[PDB]
Design a protein around this ligand. Structure first.
Ligand SMILES: *[C@@H]1O[C@H](CO)[C@@H](O[C@@H]2O[C@H](CO)[C@@H](O)[C@H](O)[C@H]2NC(C)=O)[C@H](O)[C@H]1NC(C)=O
Ligand SMILES: *[C@H]1O[C@H](CO)[C@@H](O)[C@H](O)[C@H]1NC(C)=O
Ligand SMILES: *[C@H]1O[C@H](CO)[C@@H](O)[C@H](O)[C@H]1NC(C)=O
Ligand SMILES: [Ca+2]
Ligand SMILES: [Cu+2]
Ligand SMILES: [Cu+2]
Lengths: 631, 630
């Protein structure tokens, strides 16, 4: 096991503070932020990924293990020169100096690069959590350069907790939360008061009841209207929260998550419902959000809530009603086929809460619709629907009907309990109208279409889906555990000599050896492999794989299946038309989630290889359980 | 089991002749019929509702008010068909009706405790949680909607049918009748106080004497408004992390316990200057009982209270009208590096109070470093050598009695009362027992202090401060006593408000040139003497010498600088307080806390505090680090 020197090419820039949701006179603001770049040539802006856009109006994650190396090659791009600073900023030694100028000052366009061993000083402990949380900010003016906008998160981890995949994730999913109450008597704000809001209609309110951030700013980042974006999480994969309050001396914030509870470590771990964040106290706390649906975080402090903390988070993942995954789903799943167009396109990006200007679905089309392949027959209990925000335009969909297909071929409309002819659904009312519709009787589908019945400026949408699975026996039938005896499987024929016996009794999803899989005596498509269940079974699908023969690769590319009740005559598998051309392997290893449209009820299952790689070679497994026994 | 609580919410008229609200009723209704548990400690309180780990509670609220009012929990799980919190959680038609009970409505409530929200393996037997109401969070609260809601392991109905427990719910709460449901002319709205028991008001009951009493304490308000609560006996549950004084903020609840001595209804503070006048109080009648039908050290201190002069900023000075610092000291003519006449504790060699005790020019104003492990006895022999009379009392120990007798100075109710005039000396005995020292959890040395108590700060502010250290047992045995235990060192965060000092206008005939315009009571001059400092030293005045690879404990406290709290700094350095590692210490005005530090970051470091509105009003020092020798 190794140590790593992990640099982070990072800088400081500006743009700032948007509101446009639903709740147009909106103001420009021009505060400073940290920003992660791509290399020394400070060019690639390093697009903030869907996985960390919650971070939003503060800086990128900087992360390390115990016996590690942290490095920051930093460029300032601004007016007032700023700097990097946190606690373990372990400077070094001494110098021929004049009372030790240890002053960190980073002038615009200059590059101040610093890097240091991260001792067990900064590390979390055996008593603690898998990772502790620390702040970095500009120390040029720690007072102003915090309302200005140089808040930053820093994570320090136990050894063997991160990945090749960057960051960690061993049942993780982390989020930071940055609760301040920003104010502009701080940082260059002069270049805002008479930069915008004033021309020849000016000279109105100097510092009398004007309070422009105690007119607004109650941060949970600075996407902190009463709604910030990226709080996507799986209703299990237990989520760690990084709460760090900052600001001034009224900046106590007491946060909680409705209908959820979390555990905090210290001496031990004791269970808590809300946490008085203090300024300078960098909390880590974890929870297991086993209640599906759509919630929020709020600083419970009366007057704070009532000017910006009611800031949503969504859980999708099962019991049963979780978000079906639109934050936690499928990067660019499914969309339409002509219905939907406006440069800033359709889905691709039409999810709930998706922050930005290029955000959601968008079509000035009297005849429209969008389509989600749930990639499996699913229960859909409801649909949270919301709208977007334009130039100064409020635009959304006001009315909609919902059609679904369980199959793809023949569709039809919907008729939520005893309505009339057709189930008319009520849309949004603004650019943040999360109007969680529920399906009165539920819906079982694979595909859902949404069709507008009236729009604002454009048929315009962003949405999540409510529900969860039916729960078929997606559990290994006994090929792996070998609950199915070596006796219990024959094949069409087996290859055999002296240095090998590739008998059918070897076809096992992961099996090592000299002869570690099934092989036919020669290579024919009308060749097969047969499982015999000593009883009557129900099947989801067969997991296929090839063999690593130390010789060459061997695997099966395409196959067929056949079923029987008698075990001597065979009714084979079909699509909605001809036989099922099965999408099989491509390597010595790697298995295949290959399942069946009509769950096959049988007792005699036969594999029918069609196309292969070098020889026909099979390590495999069946998924399922059983209905009644034989009759 | 499966528990039901059929109780709605009402409008009621309140008192102790000023102010009438909306409360949270208690009653056995199907309609509107009386039903009361409330007599004692229950103030404005929806009934303390208790459910165990595996249970399922059903509140059904009947609303009666001009108010649209909700019901919403914390610390518990439920379906989006409760929550009781309006905002677009998508929620179908019937899933939002829990969110706001339209005025004079009626709604059922679906409440669950799962395993995942029961209390953790080792902590409070029973968790502190409250039940709120939020439609208009600010309104619903200040008005008067709040109750206690408790949750704990498999056995209340069964192991409190057979168990004995002395438990109350104290609701430390700050309703503001200007933020009520409610809206020439001279007398605008007000309140600020415990359980709803105002000013000095007192509630009800007590617990038995020879054992322990548990209180689920719920923090309240509609603003960032911190308190700091006390009474006699230590208040040792936080975890079994073992605390000087319950310290409550915005919205706070964890749950704590204490022991007892006898009948003395013990005094119940909010103990801060600002909250005081309009503050919180209640008694505690600790009575007799129903249910019966390498040894220990001996320390010595000769300390005198004694008048001297204090230059807060000697080393460094550079004023004119050139700064906010330039303004400090005597706002008439005199205004350079700032000199006042103070009275600080100072210890002598022996009864012959003659031999000057060599000083610790790092502790500045601070008294001699007092220390005593559990089991020891402090014989503290104390002379006044300042005219205007004072005394000595340690916030920490409870067994403090005059040396030889168990008398009370001929007349007074207890020593922190009146005693010691100019000249006269008193022999005090401080005996320290396990109860006032640390534990198998804390550090090994909790931080405390001694003030004088003839006047409170009209004393203290004038210089009466010194650090008291109570500690775990050890001597060439126990833990860490094989080559050396590296020395003890104290920082004191203190605003001295000369404006109150028992040397008030004494000091104006002094340093200030001419009272030929004897001006007093002023906007800027009052601000001109509020001295935000660490050990009297201010504005990077005498810092501290240390070196790298050196390692020892810091003991720190907030005193005199009140009305507020202190998040505290240390540039680039990090400490192990509470056996975690944090970089900033949050400190109240009781605030005794004890950190530990590996000194190995060479350079100037600007120790101050994480609040950047005093560290400009002074309130900063420096620290230096560089290799040593030995
Ligand atoms: C209890 O509350 C009453 C409320 O009036 C306090 O009475 C006055 O408070 C004003 C504050 O503006 C002070 O100027 C006076 O000291 C009080 N005057 C009267 C008429 O008594 C009162 O201070 C409170 N009691 C306590 C605990 O001191
Ligand atoms: C370099 O950065 C700062 C940003 O304010 C500025 O002084 C200067 O104009 C920049 N250099 C360029 C783009 O020529
Ligand atoms: C629609 O019918 C279902 C059938 O049980 C019912 O549960 C639901 O309450 C009805 N929808 C309404 C009136 O909200
Ligand atoms: Ca609801
Ligand atoms: Cu807050
Ligand atoms: Cu108070």
């Amino acid at each position: 096991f190794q140590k790593k020197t992990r640099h982070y090419f990072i800088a400081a820039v500006e743009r700032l503070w948007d509101y446009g949701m639903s709740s147009g006179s909106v103001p420009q603001f021009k505060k400073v932020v940290f920003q992660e770049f791509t290399d020394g040539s400070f060019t690639q802006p390093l697009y903030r990924g869907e996985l960390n856009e919650h971070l939003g109006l503060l800086g990128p994650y900087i992360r390390a293990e115990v016996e590690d190396n942290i490095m920051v090659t930093f460029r300032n791009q601004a007016s007032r020169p700023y700097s990097f600073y946190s606690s373990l900023i372990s400077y070094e030694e001494d110098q021929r100096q004049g009372a030790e100028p240890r002053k960190n000052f980073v002038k615009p366009n200059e590059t101040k690069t610093y890097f240091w061993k991260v001792q067990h000083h900064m590390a979390p402990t055996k008593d603690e959590f898998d990772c502790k949380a620390w702040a970095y900010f500009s120390d040029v003016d720690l007072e102003k350069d915090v309302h200005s906008g140089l808040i930053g998160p820093l994570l320090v981890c136990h050894t063997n907790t991160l990945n090749p995949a960057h960051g960690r994730q061993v049942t993780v999913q982390e989020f930071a939360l940055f609760l301040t109450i920003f104010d502009e008597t701080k940082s260059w704000y002069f270049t805002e008061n008479m930069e915008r809001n004033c021309r020849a209609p000016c000279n109105i309110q100097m510092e009398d009841p004007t309070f422009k951030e105690n007119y607004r700013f109650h941060a949970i980042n600075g996407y902190i209207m009463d709604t910030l974006p990226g709080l996507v999480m799986a209703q299990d994969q237990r989520i760690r929260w990084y709460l760090l309050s900052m600001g001034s001396n009224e900046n106590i914030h007491s946060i909680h998550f409705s209908g959820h509870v979390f555990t905090v470590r210290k001496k031990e771990e004791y269970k808590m419902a809300l946490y008085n964040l203090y300024p300078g106290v960098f909390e880590t706390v974890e929870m297991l959000p086993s209640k599906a649906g759509i919630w929020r975080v709020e600083c419970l402090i009366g007057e704070h809530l009532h000017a910006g903390m009611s800031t949503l988070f969504l859980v999708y993942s099962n019991k049963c009603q979780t978000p079906l995954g639109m934050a936690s789903g499928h990067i660019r799943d499914f969309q339409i086929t002509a219905s939907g167009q406006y440069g800033q396109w359709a889905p691709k990006l039409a999810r709930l809460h998706y922050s930005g200007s290029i955000n959601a679905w968008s079509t000035k089309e009297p005849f429209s619709w969008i389509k989600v392949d749930l990639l499996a027959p699913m229960i859909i209990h409801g649909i949270k629907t919301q709208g977007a925000r334009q130039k100064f335009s409020s635009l959304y969909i006001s009315q909609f009907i919902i059609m679904y297909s369980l199959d793809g071929k023949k569709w039809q409309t919907y008729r939520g309990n005893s309505t009339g002819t057709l189930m008319v659904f009520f849309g949004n009312v603004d650019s943040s109208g999360i109007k969680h519709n529920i399906f009165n009787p539920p819906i079982i589908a694979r595909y859902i279409r949404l069709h507008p019945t009236h729009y604002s400026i454009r048929s315009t949408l962003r949405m999540e889906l409510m529900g969860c699975d039916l729960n078929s026996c997606s559990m290994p039938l006994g090929m792996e555990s070998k609950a199915i005896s070596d006796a219990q499987i024959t094949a069409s024929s087996y290859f055999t000599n002296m240095f090998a016996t590739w008998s059918p009794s070897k076809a096992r999803l992961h099996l090592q050896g000299r002869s570690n899989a099934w092989r036919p005596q020669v290579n024919n498509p009308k060749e097969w492999l047969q499982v015999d269940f000593q009883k009557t079974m129900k099947v989801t699908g067969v997991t296929t794989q090839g063999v690593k023969s130390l010789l060459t690769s061997m695997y099966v590319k395409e196959f067929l299946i056949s079923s029987s009740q008698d075990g001597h005559q065979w009714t084979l598998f079909f699509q909605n038309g001809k036989v099922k051309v099965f999408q099989g392997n491509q390597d010595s290893f790697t298995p295949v989630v290959n399942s069946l449209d009509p769950p096959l009820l049988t007792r005699y299952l036969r594999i029918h290889p069609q196309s292969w790689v070098h020889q026909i070679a099979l390590r495999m497994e069946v998924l399922g359980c059983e209905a009644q026994d034989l009759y | 089991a499966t528990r039901r609580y059929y109780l709605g919410a009402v409008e009621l008229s309140w008192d102790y002749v000023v102010y009438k609200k909306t409360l949270f009723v208690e009653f056995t209704d199907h309609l509107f019929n009386i039903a009361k548990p409330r007599p004692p400690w229950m103030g404005l309180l929806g009934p303390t509702i208790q459910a165990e780990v595996y249970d399922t509670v059903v509140i059904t609220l009947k609303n009666m008010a001009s108010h649209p009012v909700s019901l919403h929990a914390v610390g518990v799980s439920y379906w989006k068909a409760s929550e009781g919190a309006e905002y677009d959680d998508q929620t179908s038609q019937r899933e939002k009706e829990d969110d706001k009970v339209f005025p004079g409505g009626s709604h059922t409530y679906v409440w669950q405790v799962l395993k995942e929200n029961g209390p953790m393996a080792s902590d409070p037997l029973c968790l502190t949680y409250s039940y709120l109401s939020h439609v208009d969070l600010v309104k619903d609260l200040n008005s008067g909607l709040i109750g206690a809601l408790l949750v704990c392991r498999e056995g209340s109905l069964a192991k409190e049918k057979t168990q004995t427990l002395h438990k109350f719910i104290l609701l430390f709460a700050v309703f503001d009748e200007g933020k009520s449901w409610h809206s020439s002319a001279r007398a605008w709205p007000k309140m600020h106080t415990v359980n709803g028991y105002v000013n000095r008001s007192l509630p009800g009951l007590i617990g038995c004497h020879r054992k322990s009493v548990y209180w689920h304490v719920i923090g309240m308000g509609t603003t960032p408004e911190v308190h700091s609560i006390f009474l006699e006996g230590h208040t040792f549950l936080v975890r079994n992390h073992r605390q000087a004084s319950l310290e409550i903020s915005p919205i706070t609840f964890l749950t704590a316990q204490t022991l007892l001595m006898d009948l003395g209804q013990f005094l119940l503070f909010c103990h801060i200057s600002s909250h005081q006048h309009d503050g919180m109080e209640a008694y505690v009648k600790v009575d007799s009982c129903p249910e019966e039908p390498k040894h220990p050290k001996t320390w010595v201190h000769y300390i005198a209270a004694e008048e001297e002069d204090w230059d807060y900023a000697p080393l460094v000075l550079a004023p004119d009208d050139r700064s906010y610092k330039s303004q400090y000291l005597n706002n008439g003519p005199q205004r350079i590096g700032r000199k006042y006449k103070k009275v600080r504790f100072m210890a002598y060699t022996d009864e012959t109070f003659k031999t000057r005790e060599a000083i610790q020019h790092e502790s500045g104003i601070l008294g001699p470093l007092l220390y005593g492990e559990v089991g020891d006895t402090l014989l503290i022999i104390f002379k006044n050598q300042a005219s205007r009379p004072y005394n000595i009392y340690p916030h920490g120990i409870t067994d403090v009695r005059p040396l030889y007798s168990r008398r009370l100075p001929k007349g007074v109710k207890h020593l922190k009362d009146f005693p010691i005039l100019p000249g006269e000396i008193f022999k005090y005995k401080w005996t320290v027992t396990v109860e006032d020292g640390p534990t198998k959890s804390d550090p090994r040395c909790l931080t405390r202090y001694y003030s004088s108590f003839v006047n409170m700060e009209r004393d203290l502010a004038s210089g009466l401060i010194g650090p008291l250290l109570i500690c775990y047992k050890e001597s060439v045995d126990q833990r860490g006593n094989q080559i050396m235990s590296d020395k003890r060192n104290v920082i004191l965060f203190s605003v001295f408000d000369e404006n109150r000092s028992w040397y008030l206008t004494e000091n104006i005939q002094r340093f200030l040139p001419n009272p030929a315009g004897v001006q007093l009571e002023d906007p800027e001059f009052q601000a001109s003497n509020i001295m935000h400092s660490i050990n009297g030293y201010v504005f990077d005045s005498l810092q501290l010498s240390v070196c790298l690879h050196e390692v020892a404990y810091w003991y720190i406290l907030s005193i005199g600088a009140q009305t507020d709290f202190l998040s505290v700094f240390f540039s680039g350095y990090t400490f192990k307080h509470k056996m975690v590692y944090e970089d900033t210490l949050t400190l109240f005005p009781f605030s005794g806390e004890t950190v530990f530090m590996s000194m190995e970051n060479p350079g100037l470091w600007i120790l101050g505090c994480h609040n950047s509105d005093f560290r400009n009003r002074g309130m900063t020092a420096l620290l230096k680090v560089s290799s040593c020798d030995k």
